[model samples]
Target chain A: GLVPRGSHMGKEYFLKVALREAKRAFEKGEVPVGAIIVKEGEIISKAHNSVEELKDPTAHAEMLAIKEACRRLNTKYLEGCELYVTLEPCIMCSYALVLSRIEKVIFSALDKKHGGVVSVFNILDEPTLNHRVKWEYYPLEEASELLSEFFKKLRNN
Target chain B: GSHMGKEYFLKVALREAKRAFEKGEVPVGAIIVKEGEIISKAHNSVEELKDPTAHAEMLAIKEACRRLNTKYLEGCELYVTLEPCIMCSYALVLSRIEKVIFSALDKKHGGVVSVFNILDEPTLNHRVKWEYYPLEEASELLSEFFKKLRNNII
Candidate 1:
């Protein structure tokens, strides 16, 4: 009941789906990059950057995964494909999406709470190809709150 | 009519008017001049969207006339920063002020049209003499850039 029946689950679900591939890539001793792709509510493809190890991994790796997934989507699908990211996509990833002109995007978190909503807003406001693309968010507070609690526990330990 | 001097009254009136505007109590003010100085002033207590001073001005004028002991006021005049509305103008007429002077023009209809509507009324037209002195500088100073600031909760 929670999952949509078809391929069009939007960006939030796609970002979650990508998490599995990212974990798999990390376990394989490859790059910890991961991306999930979904269309019409069904999982379509997944990919990640294969790195040996990361000193301090950034969301850039996940962005790379999305970029790779988008590349595949462009080749497979006739028209360009939109992306949904779980976290607020990094500034670089957002710039890439703007350049790609994908029709839509969806996510849960805004960069302002953490740091890049302003840049995203500026990009969205500009007269780029996907300038008027539809973007949305999901309820990210629960996950964010949990992560904060987990980090606090680790410090106590 | 009151014992308070003109300069003191004008200063008090200006201070009160500014305080009211800052505290969102009221924005408009009307002043009455007597013996070459401001004798009395009134402003609206309600400060939200509508005009307050215009209503108060009429009441103040009425009160002034009632309190005046003299049968005739010679070399006396009223000066206000903003033009009075029609109702207030009529109130001035009823009070029989010989000459009235205002700083700014009443451009909008709500106040201006009311003044025109009662201009020919027997009581209004005969009683009050009128003069206009547009206070463009004060009006500009009063109406600086207006904006509302908001915070995002989500």
Candidate 2:
């Protein structure tokens, strides 16, 4: 009863949960970022960027949630899996994708400044590493809106 | 099958990540090894294990230290799938692992080259040399993962 009870879902529904996580973060005044890991169409884990609250530099949604997913399964590699984050992964997170061996990544918004995929630095396709992660860009307006709302509150302030 | 290669040891960590993905956990992998022997392998075990401190790096270190019959893994090396965070980075120093070699970086929680460089903290009594073993498969997993985002809503 604690976990949300629905296995059959499309990408839209998944975003619904991801966005909800982002909303939770917003309410907490933490940055409004959200992320989730999905495999076989079932959301395995979700997280809010607890950076401000934790006062920890690396407590992003993806970083925090990935550990949850792994802990739940009692495994480490997230192969043949997909991650959906409200914003693009930064350089550190891009490295996380490769380290975790995530098969694919689907994000809602592009983070130009902090983004790691193709923005600030191309850490993923460095052409000298071992693994390659495939990705898809499907923008979610709600997520982008939420991310933007938080920016002026902090980054620009 | 002793898949011997500079990156082969790290490849095992990838397989470990695949297991986590299948187990409904976030995919991440880690391993600690002596000169030629692997001490232990672990993955993200934070949620189910009910311990937020249970990242892959921490668990593998726990096993490595226990397996090696010492508190410090002075001659061992670590090969993980992603960059470690503050807690885990500090774990590396505390465990006394010789060095760390990893596949990707965690832009958000990454402690090595991203936000907090705990591996080389000057104040710490010991420092660990973490090397980035770049792999196309490893690099792109993170690099391309975040590109799907970026559309502005506000």
Clashing residue pair totals per candidate (backbone < 3 A): 20, 42
Q: Lowest-lDDT window of 10 residues in candidate 1 chain B?
A: B145-154
Q: Per-residue alpha-carbon lDDT of model 2 for B13-132, expressed as tens digits? A: 887776665554556788888877888999887555754456788778777766765667788899988887745775576567789988887776677887567677565667788898
lDDT of 2 at A14: 74
Question: For candidate 2, what is the lDDT?
Answer: 0.75
Q: Report the lDDT of model 2 for residue A72.
A: 74
Chain A TM-score for candidate 1 is 0.57
Candidate that would win on DockQ: 2
Q: What lDDT tens digits, residue by residue, belong to model 1 across residues B19-76?
A: 5456554345666667766555666443332222224464356345445543233345
- Model 1 misplaced regions, further than 4 Å: A1-157, B1-16, B47-54, B66-76, B110-127, B145-154
State the displacement of the C-alpha of residue A12, model 1, in Å, after optimal TM-score superposition: 69
Q: How far out, in Å, is residue A123 in model 2? A: 2.5
lDDT of 1 by residue, A1-157 (tens): 9974644554555666655554565456543335444544544455554323321122244344444554555441212345544455543344344434445555544555321224223344444233454565555554344335434655797
RMSD of candidate 2 to true structure, Å: 13.7
